[PDB]
């Protein structure tokens, strides 16, 4: 049990920054207003897939569809550690596993097994190859009503405009030392962990603006200098 997976957003609340997206999506599943494939966009580490999945929780979640998932249900907890039949995952980035995604994406399982929609998270999806567009392509235009698709990438303009048109984009900004830094505090203060003030400085200003790799630094900083997160051991992990 590490920080970094400890303290995985477990509903959009728990989310830190990227307001509007928040409220879009938000009351995007409290009035059913609910769109065919949504795109988020932002650099590594602003945790464009986290929002996705949160989606995908909300979308399943088996009390109904909602912003606030509870989270003890099978889809959620499932959805939650990516086990989950409706929730397929794609990474269009990775040669490893091209075989499956091309053949996914034509057998678009049109019909969810438990979930009421058959949820597809493709990641850094502008990789997918000439053959994974093209099907993707072809089914944005005439869309199963119970199929979604959550897209992510760190460059939207290498997608094809009738993708981009076709897609609600939310645009996922990188957060600034403080918001990263409050985080890290009031996290450090929930688990009963020492903290030193620079310390916690150094660790937010490493992250560059990804609260993601904030906890990971976090805890590869409170695993190097022994129990606390001492300044000396935090500059120190930023070694040499
Ligand atoms: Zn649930």
Known sequence: ??????????????????????????????????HHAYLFSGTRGVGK?????????????????????????????????????????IDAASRTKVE???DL??????????????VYLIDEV?????????????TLEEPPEHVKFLL???????????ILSRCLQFHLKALDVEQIRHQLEHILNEEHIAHEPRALQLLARAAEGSLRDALSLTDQAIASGDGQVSTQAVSAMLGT
Not at 5 to 10: A, G, L, S, T
Not at 126 to 138: C, G, I, P, V
């Open 49 to 89: 897939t986290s929002i996705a999945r949160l989606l995908a929780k909300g979308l399943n979640c088996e009390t109904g569809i909602t912003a606030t998932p509870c989270g003890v249900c099978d889809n959620c907890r499932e959805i939650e550690q990516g086990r989950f039949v409706d929730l397929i995952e």
């Open 100 to 102: 499956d995604t091309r």
């Open 105 to 118: 994406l034509d057998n678009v399982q049109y019909a969810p097994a438990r979930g009421r929609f058959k």
């Open 152 to 162: 992510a990438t760190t460059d939207p303009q290498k997608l094809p405009v009738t």
């Open 126 to 138: 502008h990789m997918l190859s000439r053959h994974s567009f093209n099907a993707l392509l072809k």
């Open 1 to 34: 049990q590490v920080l970094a997976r400890k303290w995985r957003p477990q509903t959009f609340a728990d989310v830190v920054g990227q307001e509007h997206v928040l409220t879009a999506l938000a009351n995007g599943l409290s009035l059913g207003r609910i």
